[PDB]
């Protein structure tokens, strides 16, 4: 099996548009996800709130939908609760609270796209293991 262009093709936006990532963006996404996110989201779960995971199906039912690049990029700028009712920048890292989440300070727009790309690609490779937690180790 291979990490092919099909595996790397993911929804760009809510309207059905896709984007094909390069192998380099994928690797970048994995690296930056480790650098800034995996301490709480290793494996697609959330250590500090296990009710919410990074599974594609979960992301799709967030408000606004987070199952696409644009949704994830926006999350990383201005994170909300799952119903979109509340802005949680003060306790979740984002570009908006780079003062208090210092690893966010040198993430470029392109970095945010790469991480979003990682989050959307991993479950296409790992299946239910992504966001599955220890049951699936």
């Amino acid at each position: 099996a291979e990490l092919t262009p099909e595996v790397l093709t993911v929804p760009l936006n809510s309207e059905g548009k896709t984007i094909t990532l390069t192998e380099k963006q994928y690797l970048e996404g994995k690296r930056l996800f480790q650098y800034a996110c995996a301490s709480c989201h290793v494996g697609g779960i959330t250590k500090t709130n296990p009710s919410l995971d990074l599974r594609t199906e979960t992301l799709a039912l967030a408000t606004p939908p987070r199952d696409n690049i644009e949704g994830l990029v926006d999350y990383m700028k201005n994170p909300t609760t799952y119903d979109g009712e509340q802005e949680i920048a003060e306790v979740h890292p984002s570009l908006r609270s780079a003062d208090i989440f210092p690893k966010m300070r040198n993430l470029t727009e392109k970095d945010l796209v790469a991480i979003a790309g990682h989050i959307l690609v991993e479950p296409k490779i790992l299946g239910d293991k992504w966001g599955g937690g220890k049951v699936y180790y």
């Binding site: 099996a1 291979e2 092919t4 299946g127």
Partner: protein
């Protein structure tokens, strides 16, 4: 006993002449065994792209005793 001491042998110029060639030739031969991919086919070990087909969800486990050879062959054909 009898044999020349190792001490003698491995400090002798003639030893180093012979082995400054044989040691590196074997090492390089070892390297090529892997770099050519020859190791994978002799032993039947999968390369990183040959463990699973592109959409396969299960392991090619042998489940037959007397036609396991043929199963591996089948399992190998669809990759």
């Amino acid at each position: 006993t009898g044999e020349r001491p190792f001490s003698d042998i491995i400090t002798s110029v003639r030893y180093w002449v012979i082995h400054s060639i044989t040691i590196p030739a074997l090492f390089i031969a070892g390297w090529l065994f892997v770099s050519t991919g020859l190791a994978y086919d002799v032993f039947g070990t999968p390369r990183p792209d040959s463990y699973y087909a592109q959409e396969q969800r299960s392991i090619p486990l042998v489940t037959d005793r007397f036609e396991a050879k043929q199963q591996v062959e089948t399992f190998l054909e669809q990759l």
